[model samples]
Target: MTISQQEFGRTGLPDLSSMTEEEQIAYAMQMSLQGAEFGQAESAD
Candidate 1:
């Protein structure tokens, strides 16, 4: 599966074809956690 570059930054996601099954899962998890940081820019509201 392709990953969203906007959420992942420059490093982005690894090529699915190049990754092992375990690597795929690990990377997906990393993205999920980082992407969930709602306070990334701050809470000025």
Candidate 2:
């Protein structure tokens, strides 16, 4: 029930690789928030 990083890159931002575990976690949070806001903004249209 989860999506992969490559798909995320194509759909949202660039692909995630060569990242440390902490980097991945941080990136996920950052991108997830961006994605949520993006959805909300688009929905408001």
Candidate 3:
């Protein structure tokens, strides 16, 4: 599963260099979920 730039931008995430480690992980997980959902939807179609 892959996240598009648009979906990632929707999260309003900051630059990684300015984020805490936890924030980075949370952002990654959030984006991953979006990608996974998109993949599932595509598969269903």
> Best candidate per TM-score, number?
3
Assess each prediction's global lDDT (C-alpha) against the native: 0.64, 0.66, 0.65
List, residue by residue over 1-45, the lDDT tens digit for candidate 3.
654546555566554654678777988788878765658644676
lDDT per residue, candidate 2, 1-45, as tens digits? 655656456865654454667678988788878765668644676
Stretches of model 3 off by over 4 angstroms after superposition: 1-19, 35-45
Mind sharing the TM-score for model 3?
Answer: 0.37
TM-score to true structure, per model:
0.34, 0.36, 0.37
Superposed by TM-score, candidate 2 places the C-alpha of residue 1 at a distance from the truth, in angstroms, of: 43
A best-first ranking of the candidates according to their TM-score comes to: 3, 2, 1
Candidate 1's TM-score reads 0.34
Measured on C-alpha atoms, candidate 2 has an lDDT of: 0.66
Give the 10-residue window scoring lowest on summed lDDT in candidate 2. Answer: 11-20
Worst 10 residues of 3 by lDDT: 1-10
Q: How many backbone clashes does candidate 1 have?
A: 0
